[PDB]
Design a protein around this ligand. Structure first.
Ligand SMILES: Nc1ncnc2c1ncn2[C@@H]1O[C@H](COP(=O)(O)OP(=O)(O)OP(=O)(O)O)[C@@H](O)[C@H]1O
Ligand SMILES: Nc1ncnc2c1ncn2[C@@H]1O[C@H](COP(=O)(O)OP(=O)(O)OP(=O)(O)O)[C@@H](O)[C@H]1O
Lengths: 428, 153, 146, 426, 50
């Protein structure tokens, strides 16, 4: 059990000294192994008097669940409730006692009988279990009950304790793709190295992809210098660059100091010194080959340096294309898949194949700007490429539904009982 | 200008300000545009179709005239301003500064009724090389003018 | 270079006709691109409304939703003004005449009262209907909003 | 009867007694209210000690008008700022207990090397009751006279608060100050803000306030009020159709039906809030007040045209827009409009709310005023509102001619013993 | 609005000083009070009437 290991390690560490031995102690190895074997899972969630929904209990499968319904049946409410629950866990992991998102005043039911709204959820991790409750009363009412947050704090402290001993600790992935995925070509036509950039401060929704462009530029720059050599003593050259920057600064000041720090970071290339199988070139190849699977029409994608700037060049048939000249359908897939692979490639710095982490992804209206031929193969492709992830998707197109297994679908209905229409769920 | 009337004395002053605005812009650089007449100030009576303001500047014996006009939206005929006289007058000023140095340029200023507020900001209201064209940027008095005044002092 | 003689000739006819006609009409051109989902529920006291404000752009984008709300409430206030005033005076007569007819129906039907009620109702209704706010549908107001 | 004696008796009886309904029914509350209404809020004396340009002054004010004449640099606006400082503490105490007012900034103290502290004193009397307020602030390295002696001013707030806590729609004193450029509740209900400072030449905001209020009044003129009106109208005809119009147990049934209709109409009218404060009464009261101020006009109305809307004024045989007025009439228009709005919202019980009590301070009444307006502005102002104090500063001699000699004050500050000191003459 | 926030003593001397400190600058002024009007001559006053 994870709790037993945590208790034993905390007790040992509290009554010990010489942190070096604590790091080399068997407690860290046991905790790491137990955490690694654990897989993220969210088994169930209950909703009470939230928006149209008055009372609902939902259980989610391990791999994939699909919600189908007409317009106005609460598909977006379920996703918003899950995102609300996940926000508190993210906030507590990133910063101690960091508040999350609340429930707004107008989210509660418009009926006169309802006095409060609540969301309950349960997270199962191997054998360890936790429960989360978020509540919010109406406006101008008594009995303002509070919410419980001890479970999330207990779960979070394990993660930070593990990440303190080892700087290469992995983290779960939680992302949410909303309708705002559209506009300005998704992100087109509108450094990145820290593991906490994608997590913590970055929210669950999407705003822009320019960081993907800069990240790709950094990947290519390290790819040519490290894997392809052509740099001789790169460590010595970067150290001499740092010394030259310091000399220039000695004989705008903040920018010069930042440049000196950046040169020192580049000079730490020999400090890192891995040159492993998962080098920069291997990551570049994996990212490009991953993208090309979802765009069978194209032939190759390359990065071109010219006019003191970088541009992305695509091959279609026998014509060269830029990024601005693509259609909306291929822009949506390019942005979604690129950001999905960017988070996994960035939060799992030790896996041999970093597209093997754990997490949960929520997608709304996956069938935006796609012809039926593409709609018949997107779900199996996404499932196959990211195996150890949990997917929650909503649809209303029969073409998407026709290719889903019978144990993964959920159907929403509006049934009037006792003169009041209440949302219900069912299975074929 | 004494004698109150409904049309308002201020309109005459800003009418002159529109004409004067074209001279400085051309002085700074050739063919620079100025202040246009906005379509929302043309008379609302059904009879009218366009508005125009004209004036004449006499310099000893030299005489220049300028007309600024604008027609209502959807009119059958279009009207355009004539700027040959102003451009010609501004050319000699530009040439003089281009050849000789330390030359002087005409002064144009306009003090509205809001100076009480801007001037009254003395309480808190909280560059090295003072050139000539810095004042040749605006015609209406403002708070920043007094802020510049203190630094100049 | 471009060819522009035909479209200038055609536009001149429209301008000339508008110059001599009080309420000449104009053609409608619109375009609803894929960027209309951003305006899915995401001005110095505008007062004067004209038919040339819809010619600012060929594409529907951003602020056109806001002006729609401003235009709609203006129509509502116009209808309220039409609902009041002299239209209430004939309304005051008409209900009373109906009530008088109802009273004539009651009391075991009392000519005399029946003749007076019928004459007054017919005269008032005919006089009110004759004007019909000038030319009936010409009043607009309530009809446009509905 | 002494107000203090009545207050003591009422408080003692209320505290000892229980069953609040009887406490309200008690004659003591009626006596207190009756005494309170028969009063006139007016200041009596003001003392200034080392404030800005003046270091020692005892000024006595009148009860109708007090015009101060002088030139730039004579303490004309410091007297007004002193009275506003005194007033703000009373307003703060009225709103909430032990609420700090407005202090004195460091730069406002006299710059003389021998100065030690600045103090201001005031005396407010009503009927027979009297009060005294003293505010002090020492610059540095000294001892301000005692402290902020605000014990007396809390009694007046307690007196007003006790009455307002039991009986609704009571009356409160008026406090307004029209300064220079510088720069739940009924007030929070429609649009209004609660403050002492107001600024003129804000015609755009008052214009939009008038438009919005007219829209709300028109909205509330329809709907449920139609039903009662409709019910009355038929009944009026029906009642005539039995007795009056009919004559150019059927009788018992007809009389019973008419009586039942009258009772139902009375019940419907009684049900719901009374006149009190509604959009229609506020709109036509403000419009009527402005019409009283300027009888040169006949009517003013808002017209919704085919493609626009505007406000129309009738003068003689000419209809003029609200935007065709000169700068002179805009400021008087908004001055009277705001004064009437504030007076109406504070006296919801008087049949004519234009007979309230309070004090209004106006500085430089000649701003953007044509001399013809200056000739009779003071005559109109004291005639429309006959139960308020006005403290006004005068700059030009055009206004001074009309004013009576009884209420004139002239500043001719002499240098006594080689020391400048303001002196007031009569 | 030449006569803003000026007592009558200052109103009768403002024109003299403006026309004496800057003798070569053309001035356009709108006035409102008789004190300013009296000092100026008759060839420099334009009256607008409806
Ligand atoms: N406070 C509320 N009270 C009552 N009904 C509400 C309330 N809030 C929302 N609704 C109803 O909820 C219905 C469903 O809204 P919702 O946004 O969940 O639709 P959806 O079909 O899931 O959305 P999408 O197309 O974005 O996936 C709406 O038709 C609305 O009438
Ligand atoms: N701290 C101070 N010590 C001495 N004199 C002061 C001080 N502060 C201000 N004064 C004097 O105050 C005078 C101006 O006071 P005040 O504002 O009352 O003038 P005013 O002309 O009556 O004002 P307004 O035009 O606002 O009616 C100045 O002449 C100045 O000498």
């Amino acid at each position: 059990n994870l709790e037993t290991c945590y208790v034993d390690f905390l007790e040992l560490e509290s009554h010990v000294i010489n942190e070096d031995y604590l790091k080399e102690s068997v407690e860290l190895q046991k905790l790491i192994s137990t955490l690694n074997e654990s897989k993220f899972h969210l088994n169930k969630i209950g909703i009470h008097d939230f928006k149209r929904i008055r009372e609902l209990q939902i259980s989610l499968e391990d791999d994939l669940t699909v919600f189908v319904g007409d317009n106005g049946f609460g598909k977006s409410t379920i996703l918003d409730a899950i995102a609300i629950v996940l926000s508190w866990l993210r906030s507590n992991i990133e910063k101690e006692s960091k508040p999350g998102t609340y429930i707004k005043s107008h989210e509660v039911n418009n009926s006169v009988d309802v006095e409060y709204a609540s969301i309950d959820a349960n997270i199962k991790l191997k054998d360890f279990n936790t429960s989360i409750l978020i509540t919010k009363a109406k406006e101008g009412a008594y009995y303002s009950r509070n919410n419980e947050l001890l479970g999330v704090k207990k779960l979070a402290s394990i993660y930070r304790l593990v990440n303190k001993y080892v700087d290469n600790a992995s983290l779960p992935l939680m992302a949410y793709y909303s309708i705002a995925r559209s506009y300005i070509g998704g992100g087109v036509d509108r450094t990145v190295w820290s593991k906490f950039d994608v997590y913590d401060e970055i929210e669950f929704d999407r705003n822009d992809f320019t960081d993907f462009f800069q990240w790709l530029v950094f990947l290519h720059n390290r790819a040519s210098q490290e894997k392809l050599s052509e740099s001789q003593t790169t460590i010595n050259a970067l150290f001499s660059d740092i010394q030259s920057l310091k000399a220039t600064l000695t004989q705008v000041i903040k920018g010069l100091e930042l440049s000196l720090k950046e040169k020192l970071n580049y000079m730490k290339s020999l400090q890192s010194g891995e040159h492993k199988f998962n080098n920069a070139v291997s990551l570049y190849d994996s990212v490009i080959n991953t993208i090309l699977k979802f765009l069978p029409e194209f032939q190759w994608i390359k990065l071109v340096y010219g006019d003191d700037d970088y541009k992305i060049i695509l091959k279609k048939g026998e014509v060269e294309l830029d990024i601005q000249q693509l259609s909306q359908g291929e822009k949506t897939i390019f942005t979604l898949v690129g950001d999905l692979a960017r988070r996994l490639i960035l939060l799992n710095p030790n896996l041999s194949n970093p597209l093997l982490g754990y997490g949960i992804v929520l997608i709304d209206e996956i069938d935006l700007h796609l012809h039926p031929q593409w709609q018949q193969t997107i779900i199996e492709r996404l499932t196959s490429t990211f195996p150890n992830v949990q997917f929650v998707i909503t649809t209303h197109s029969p073409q998407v539904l026709s290719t889903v297994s019978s144990r993964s679908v959920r159907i929403l209905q509006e049934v009037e009982v006792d003169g009041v229409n209440d949302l219900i769920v069912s299975h074929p | 200008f004494v004698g109150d009337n409904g049309f308002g004395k201020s309109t005459i002053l800003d009418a002159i300000a529109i004409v004067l605005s074209w001279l400085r812009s051309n002085i700074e650089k050739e063919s620079k545009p100025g202040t246009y007449i906005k379509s929302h100030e043309v008379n609302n009576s059904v009879d009218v179709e366009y508005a125009s303001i004209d004036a004449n500047i006499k310099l000893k014996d030299f005489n220049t005239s300028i007309l600024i006009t604008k027609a209502k939206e959807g009119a059958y005929y279009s009207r355009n301003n004539e700027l040959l006289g102003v451009k010609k007058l501004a050319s000699i000023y530009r040439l003089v500064n281009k050849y000789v140095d330390n030359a002087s340029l005409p002064l144009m200023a306009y003090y509205s009724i809001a100076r009480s507020y801007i001037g009254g900001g003395v309480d808190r209201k909280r560059k090295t090389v003072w050139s000539k064209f810095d004042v040749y940027d605006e015609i209406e008095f403002d708070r920043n003018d007094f802020t510049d005044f203190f630094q100049w002092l | 270079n471009n060819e522009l003689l035909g479209v200038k000739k055609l536009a001149s006819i429209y301008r000339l006709v508008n110059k001599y006609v009080d309420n000449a009409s104009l053609p409608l051109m619109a375009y609803y691109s894929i960027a209309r989902s951003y305006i899915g529920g995401g001005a110095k006291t505008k007062t004067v409304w004209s038919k040339f404000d819809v010619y600012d752009e060929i594409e529907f984008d951003r602020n056109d939703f806001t002006d729609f709300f401003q235009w709609l409430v203006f129509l509502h206030n116009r209808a309220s003004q039409e609902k009041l005033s002299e239209s209430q005076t004939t309304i005051n007569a008409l209900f009373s005449d109906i009530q008088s007819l109802k009273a004539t129906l009651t009391q075991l039907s009392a000519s005399t009262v029946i003749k007076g009620l019928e004459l007054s109702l017919k005269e008032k209704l005919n006089y009110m209907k004759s004007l019909q706010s000038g030319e009936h549908k010409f009043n607009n107001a309530v009809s446009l909003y509905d």
